[PDB]
């Protein structure tokens, strides 16, 4: 059969492609592990932790959330570990408030 | 060379030591458990 199974301009597009998938698997890795703290820091009772605690939960959220590589933010998982550290932060502290 | 296995001066020490060190792990693990009840009794911090 004729086929081109060298590393033409496909096998460099998916080479490409394959480079993006790691860097967004690994924004989706850290923005899991900044995520964890956020939601702890979220769904921790408004009367057992303070909003102090609540905003220093957000904050190891983000902090966890940033910890992605510059590919891994551009890929959508470091962004929405950050998103989900500042949300719980945020609701850590209005229970708390 | 030693005593036959008989209920001895030794072998009654070592039955009556055996029955108190039995009754004191009784005793303490009785106590831990209600030691550790009294502390869940008393834990009411009223933050949480």
Same mark, same amino acid.
């Given at each position: 059969?004729?086929?081109?199974? *060298? ?6 597009? +998916?080479? +490409?492609? *394959? ?8 924004? @989706? ?16 009772? @408004? +009367? ?12 190891? *959220? ?18 929405? +570990? ?16």
């Amino acid at each position: 059969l004729t086929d081109t199974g *060298l590393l033409s301009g496909s096998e460099e597009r +998916v080479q +490409v492609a *394959l480079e993006e998938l790691q860097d967004l698997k690994g924004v @989706w890795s850290e923005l899991s592990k900044v995520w964890e703290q956020i939601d702890q820091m979220k769904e921790q009772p @408004w +009367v057992s932790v303070q909003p102090r605690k609540l905003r220093q939960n957000l904050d190891a *959220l983000l902090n966890q959330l940033k910890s992605f590589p510059a590919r891994l933010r551009q890929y959508a998982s470091y962004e929405f +570990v950050q998103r989900l550290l500042k949300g719980y932060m945020k609701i850590n502290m209005l229970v708390i408030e």
